Amino acid sequence: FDNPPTNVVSHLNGDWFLFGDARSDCNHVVNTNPRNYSYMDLNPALCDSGKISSKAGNSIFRSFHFTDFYNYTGEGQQIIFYEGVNFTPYHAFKCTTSGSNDIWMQNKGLFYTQVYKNMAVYRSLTFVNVPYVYNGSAQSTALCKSGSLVLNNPAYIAREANFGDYYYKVEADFYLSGCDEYIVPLCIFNGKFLSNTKYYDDSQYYFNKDTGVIYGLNSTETITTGFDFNCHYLVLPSGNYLAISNELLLTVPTKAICLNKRKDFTPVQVVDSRWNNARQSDNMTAVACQPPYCYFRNSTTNYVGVYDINHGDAGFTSILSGLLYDSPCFSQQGVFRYDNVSSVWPLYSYGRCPTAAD
Amino acid sequence: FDNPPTNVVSHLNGDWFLFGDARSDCNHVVNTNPRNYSYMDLNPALCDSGKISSKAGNSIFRSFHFTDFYNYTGEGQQIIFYEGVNFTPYHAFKCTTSGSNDIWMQNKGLFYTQVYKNMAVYRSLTFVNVPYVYNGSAQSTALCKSGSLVLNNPAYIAREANFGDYYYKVEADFYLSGCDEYIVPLCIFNGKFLSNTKYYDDSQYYFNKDTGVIYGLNSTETITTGFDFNCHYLVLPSGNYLAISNELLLTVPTKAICLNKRKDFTPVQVVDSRWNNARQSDNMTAVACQPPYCYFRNSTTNYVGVYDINHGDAGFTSILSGLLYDSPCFSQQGVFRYDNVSSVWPLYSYGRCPTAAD
Numbered sequence: 020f021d022n023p024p025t026n027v028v029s030h031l032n033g034d035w036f037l038f039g040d041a042r043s044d045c046n047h048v049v050n051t052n053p054r055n056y057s058y059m060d061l062n063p064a065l066c067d068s069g070k071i072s073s074k075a076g077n078s079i080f081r082s083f084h085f086t087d088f089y090n091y092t093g094e095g096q097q098i099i100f101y102e103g104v105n106f107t108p109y110h111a112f113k114c115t116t117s118g119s120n121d122i123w124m125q126n127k128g129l130f131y132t133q134v135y136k137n138m139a140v141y142r143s144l145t146f147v148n149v150p151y152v153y154n155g156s157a158q159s160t161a162l163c164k165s166g167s168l169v170l171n172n173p174a175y176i177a178r179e180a181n182f183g184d185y186y187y188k189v190e191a192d193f194y195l196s197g198c199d200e201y202i203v204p205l206c207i208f209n210g211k212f213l214s215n216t217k218y219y220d221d222s223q224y225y226f227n228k229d230t231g232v233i234y235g236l237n238s239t240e241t242i243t244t245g246f247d248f249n250c251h252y253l254v255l256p257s258g259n260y261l262a263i264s265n266e267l268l269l270t271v272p273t274k275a276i277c278l279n280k281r282k283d284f285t286p287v288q289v290v291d292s293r294w295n296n297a298r299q300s301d302n303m304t305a306v307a308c309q310p311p312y313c314y315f316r317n318s319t320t321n322y323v324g325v326y327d328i329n330h331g332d333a334g335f336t337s338i339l340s341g342l343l344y345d346s347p348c349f350s351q352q353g354v355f356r357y358d359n360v361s362s363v364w365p366l367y368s369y370g371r372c373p374t375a376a377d
Numbered sequence: 378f379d380n381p382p383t384n385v386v387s388h389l390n391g392d393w394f395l396f397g398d399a400r401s402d403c404n405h406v407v408n409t410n411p412r413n414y415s416y417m418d419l420n421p422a423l424c425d426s427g428k429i430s431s432k433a434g435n436s437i438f439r440s441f442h443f444t445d446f447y448n449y450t451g452e453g454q455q456i457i458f459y460e461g462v463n464f465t466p467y468h469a470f471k472c473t474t475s476g477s478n479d480i481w482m483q484n485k486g487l488f489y490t491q492v493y494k495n496m497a498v499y500r501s502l503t504f505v506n507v508p509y510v511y512n513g514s515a516q517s518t519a520l521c522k523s524g525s526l527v528l529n530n531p532a533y534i535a536r537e538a539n540f541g542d543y544y545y546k547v548e549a550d551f552y553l554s555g556c557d558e559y560i561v562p563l564c565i566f567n568g569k570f571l572s573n574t575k576y577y578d579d580s581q582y583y584f585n586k587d588t589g590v591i592y593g594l595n596s597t598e599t600i601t602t603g604f605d606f607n608c609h610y611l612v613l614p615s616g617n618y619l620a621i622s623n624e625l626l627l628t629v630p631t632k633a634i635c636l637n638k639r640k641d642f643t644p645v646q647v648v649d650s651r652w653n654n655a656r657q658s659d660n661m662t663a664v665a666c667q668p669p670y671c672y673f674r675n676s677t678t679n680y681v682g683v684y685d686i687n688h689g690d691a692g693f694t695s696i697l698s699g700l701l702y703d704s705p706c707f708s709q710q711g712v713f714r715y716d717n718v719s720s721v722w723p724l725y726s727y728g729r730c731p732t733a734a735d
């Protein structure tokens with residue numbers, strides 16, 4: 020008898036949910052010709068399960084920030100993630116041509132940190148639009164963009180006619196409702212921002228009108244180039260808020276991650292989402308995935324897909340294969356198929372776990 | 378054979394530490410006459426261990442906020458707490474005679490929440506003085522006090538000579554060094570605060586000069602009585618900060634909980650700290666003590682001490698008795714003395730845990 024920790028994602032019972040991308044997007048097949056499921060790492064037998072929310076070409080972070088939006092939606096006791104690759108150093112995203120992808124990688128890590136931590140204590144994740152009211156005559160403006168990627172959360176509001184510089188103070192009202200908690204971005208350009216001969220230091224506050232909490236960020240960088248849009252990811256309660264800009268452009272949330280249905284602490288499972296080695300990936304989801312709230316799974320091999328080089332890999336297919344059955348014990352080291360005896364002590368475990376005793 | 382979960386605090390190996398009060402203060406005995414150890418729930422055999430930091434009449438919260446200060450100091454992999462009673466509804470603390478003990482109970486809960494969460498990931502806790510510089514000629518003033526309890530953290534700075542009201546903006550610089558992280562209070566009077574015929578709305582911000590993060594609290598209550606000093610407990614990095622007051626009195630930290638030596642996630646153990654039923658206690662440490670970061674232990678009986686009615690209880694002596702030996706498995710349900718087989722599945726477990734399988 021053998022009960023080793025196994026390198027899979029699985030589930031204790033039927034109460035689970037997976038968020039993903041093309042590699043687990045059953046619907047994508049309609050856009051293959053001829054129709055072919057080999058682009059998937061997920062087993063197509065799971066296509067009717069109702070336990071998957073995935074979109075080819077997307078990721079939760081990508082949908083959070085950009086106009087390229089998929090309404091990821093799901094509920095379960097155990098949450099599993101196999102997405103992230105659709106925002107990587109490969110995309111070379113920066114708000115401006117003299118920006119920094121490293122900043123955006125930092126943003127990515129901070130975002131997934133909050134997602135993973137919160138999905139260990141909430142059953143349900145979806146996206147909600149955040150309504151806001153701005154009183155001026157200025158409209159929103161797409162200041163942050165690169166190729167096909169256009170930032171739309173937070174929104175930037177243009178300067179009013181009457182102002183000749185960016186030293187002004189303006190505000191908008193944004194209202195959070197419908198969820199137990201909300202993940203929203205609070206961001207600034209952290210750097211010396213040149214506009215019409217003057218260098219600015221972006222400043223943005225959010226204010227909960229009823230709790231009275233102020234969350235703010237002021238620019239502190241002294242560099243005049245190679246800077247970008249630094250974001251923090253706030254986990255906020257329902258309420259009515261002001262977004263108060265003290266310098267540069269007013270920014271306000273337009274989308275939130277909607278967290279609902281508090282649950283007993285249940286660690287999430289995260290699968291490394293990367294490209295074939297020919298493309299630059301990042302380890303930000305690994306950084307974000309820590310005990311006790313998350314188990315991280317990765318293959319030992321290069322991603323080499325059979326459909327194309329970036330889709331349908333033996334290693335990741337193996338990892339996802341655990342979704343085809345129930346497993347009793349989840350641990351840092353892997354999943355144990357039996358709940359009785361093992362040769363190693365499971366670490367940070369969840370479920371019915373074996374003893375490594377005599 | 379029998380391996381039930383047991384209602385004790387214990388330790389996996391010798392790497393542990395206990396924070397407490399008189400009920401575990403070996404030194405107190407010098408202040409008994411004749412000398413008598415029966416005031417303790419801790420076994421005196423542990424008096425030479427070097428693994429206890431306790432002071433009769435004190436608590437970590439009490440020392441955090443008030444002039445009645447004990448420098449709680451300790452390091453261990455597994456941290457245990459048996460303190461809190463020395464700040465309870467019994468003490469009837471309020472900043473003013475028309476204040477609110479309920480507010481202070483809320484403060485207590487919020488504080489212990491941060492302590493317990495952080496001591497699951499740091500080995501070391503102590504107190505550090507927080508130096509600050511205020512530029513005015515005004516001195517500190519003890520605005521919040523009740524009987525023998527006098528608040529000294531945060532400090533209040535009096536108004537300057539030149540000001541005739543409390544609508545002013547002033548600041549101090551405070552510097553955090555020597556620790557990985559710091560717990561500091563950010564507080565305001567949350568209410569309509571009457572001074573010389575005018576009603577004020579307290580406002581206080583802290584600003585990290587290098588990260589550029591602003592943490593602020595503004596008063597939102599409309600009541601003119603029955604309000605008090607609402608605190609939030611920030612977990613901050615080393616750095617140089619400004620305390621920026623926008624209304625009422627400037628407040629600034631004078632003491633921090635010093636968190637050092639990051640460790641692998643290890644749940645803390647907390648023992649209910651209460652008075653005999655003749656006195657009003659509270660459940661704020663229970664509220665603060667949640668999975669997966671904390672296990673809470675409580676006796677099933679009234680606290681009835683043998684030394685006096687509030688010292689030396691059979692139930693709590695029993696709970697602490699587990700410190701006299703090593704135990705392999707810690708769980709929500711209790712401590713299992715054996716790592717092999719049990720009849721229940723340990724929940725949120727830490728250590729070498731038994732299987733409830735056939």
Ligand SMILES: *[C@@H]1O[C@H](CO)[C@@H](O[C@@H]2O[C@H](CO)[C@@H](O)[C@H](O)[C@H]2NC(C)=O)[C@H](O)[C@H]1NC(C)=O
Nearest residue numbers: 187188220221222237264265266582584591621
């Ligand atoms: C954060 O940045 C804002 C905007 O720069 C600061 O507010 C401005 O501060 C300068 C003083 O250096 C004044 O000249 C402006 O009038 C202020 N603008 C406002 C209030 O809209 C703000 O003080 C910074 N917050 C801090 C340091 O906590």
Ligand SMILES: *[C@@H]1O[C@H](CO)[C@@H](O[C@@H]2O[C@H](CO)[C@@H](O)[C@H](O)[C@H]2NC(C)=O)[C@H](O)[C@H]1NC(C)=O
Nearest residue numbers: 224226233263545546578579580595622623624
């Ligand atoms: C938090 O409270 C402060 C102090 O009341 C507010 O700052 C004052 O706001 C009033 C406007 O209602 C002005 O009359 C004062 O001049 C301001 N004092 C200052 C800036 O020192 C502040 O706006 C509040 N913060 C919010 C609402 O985010």
Ligand SMILES: CO[C@]1(C(=O)O)C[C@H](OC(C)=O)[C@@H](NC(C)=O)[C@H]([C@H](O)[C@H](O)COC(C)=O)O1
Nearest residue numbers: 115117162178185211212213214215216267268
């Ligand atoms: C109009 O040309 C410039 C300028 O020098 O003013 C070029 C300037 O480009 C620079 C400095 O590399 C751009 N600022 C930034 C940080 O990208 C700056 C801004 O895009 C532009 O001023 C609008 O700024 C705001 C705050 O909306 O535009």
Ligand SMILES: CO[C@]1(C(=O)O)C[C@H](OC(C)=O)[C@@H](NC(C)=O)[C@H]([C@H](O)[C@H](O)COC(C)=O)O1
Nearest residue numbers: 473475520536543569570571572573574625626
């Ligand atoms: C001087 O008498 C009074 C006053 O009406 O002004 C009584 C006043 O007592 C009240 C309103 O119950 C006190 N304010 C509060 C909230 O306790 C108030 C303050 O203690 C005093 O004004 C000092 O206030 C500040 C901000 O230092 O003092």
Ligand SMILES: *[C@@H]1O[C@H](CO)[C@@H](O)[C@H](O)[C@H]1NC(C)=O
Nearest residue numbers: 090091092145146147148274
């Ligand atoms: C996403 O889908 C959920 C479920 O249908 C819905 O409640 C929510 O409003 C949607 N969010 C959008 C479209 O932003």
Ligand SMILES: *[C@@H]1O[C@H](CO)[C@@H](O)[C@H](O)[C@H]1NC(C)=O
Nearest residue numbers: 301302303304305306307308
């Ligand atoms: C992520 O990558 C950096 C190197 O770029 C490394 O320092 C860090 O340890 C990595 N973290 C994880 C969790 O793999």
Ligand SMILES: *[C@@H]1O[C@H](CO)[C@@H](O)[C@H](O)[C@H]1NC(C)=O
Nearest residue numbers: 291302305317318319320321
């Ligand atoms: C995943 O494993 C592959 C192959 O060992 C390795 O190249 C890669 O760095 C790992 N990814 C992370 C995020 O650790």
Ligand SMILES: *[C@@H]1O[C@H](CO)[C@@H](O)[C@H](O)[C@H]1NC(C)=O
Nearest residue numbers: 053054055056057325326327
């Ligand atoms: C599906 O794609 C795989 C991998 O490219 C290929 O071997 C196979 O011919 C395809 N099947 C069909 C029916 O096109």
Ligand SMILES: *[C@@H]1O[C@H](CO)[C@@H](O)[C@H](O)[C@H]1NC(C)=O
Nearest residue numbers: 020022357358359360734735
């Ligand atoms: C462990 O469980 C497996 C599967 O039921 C079984 O083959 C083996 O005998 C068990 N070992 C025990 C109970 O010691």
Ligand SMILES: *[C@@H]1O[C@H](CO)[C@@H](O)[C@H](O)[C@H]1NC(C)=O
Nearest residue numbers: 448449450503504505506632
């Ligand atoms: C508390 O004790 C520790 C250890 O001796 C010391 O480093 C620290 O400065 C003390 N804190 C005080 C006295 O505020």
Ligand SMILES: *[C@@H]1O[C@H](CO)[C@@H](O)[C@H](O)[C@H]1NC(C)=O
Nearest residue numbers: 659660661662663664665666
């Ligand atoms: C604390 O006491 C209140 C009643 O005052 C109760 O609602 C709450 O559930 C209690 N919490 C715990 C953890 O015992």
Ligand SMILES: *[C@@H]1O[C@H](CO)[C@@H](O)[C@H](O)[C@H]1NC(C)=O
Nearest residue numbers: 649660663675676677678679
């Ligand atoms: C501890 O147990 C006692 C006796 O059952 C009970 O009265 C008390 O409410 C409990 N305390 C907490 C914080 O639950």
Ligand SMILES: *[C@@H]1O[C@H](CO)[C@@H](O)[C@H](O)[C@H]1NC(C)=O
Nearest residue numbers: 411412413414415683684685
């Ligand atoms: C210690 O106190 C206990 C409980 O009050 C009492 O029974 C005993 O007489 C005391 N012992 C001494 C030596 O005073």
Ligand SMILES: *[C@@H]1O[C@H](CO)[C@@H](O)[C@H](O)[C@H]1NC(C)=O
Nearest residue numbers: 376377378380715716717718
């Ligand atoms: C459990 O361990 C105890 C103590 O060693 C022993 O008495 C008992 O036989 C063990 N049961 C097993 C190994 O099934």
Ligand SMILES: [K+]
Nearest residue numbers: 222223264268
């Ligand atoms: K801004």
Ligand SMILES: [K+]
Nearest residue numbers: 580581622626
């Ligand atoms: K203040």
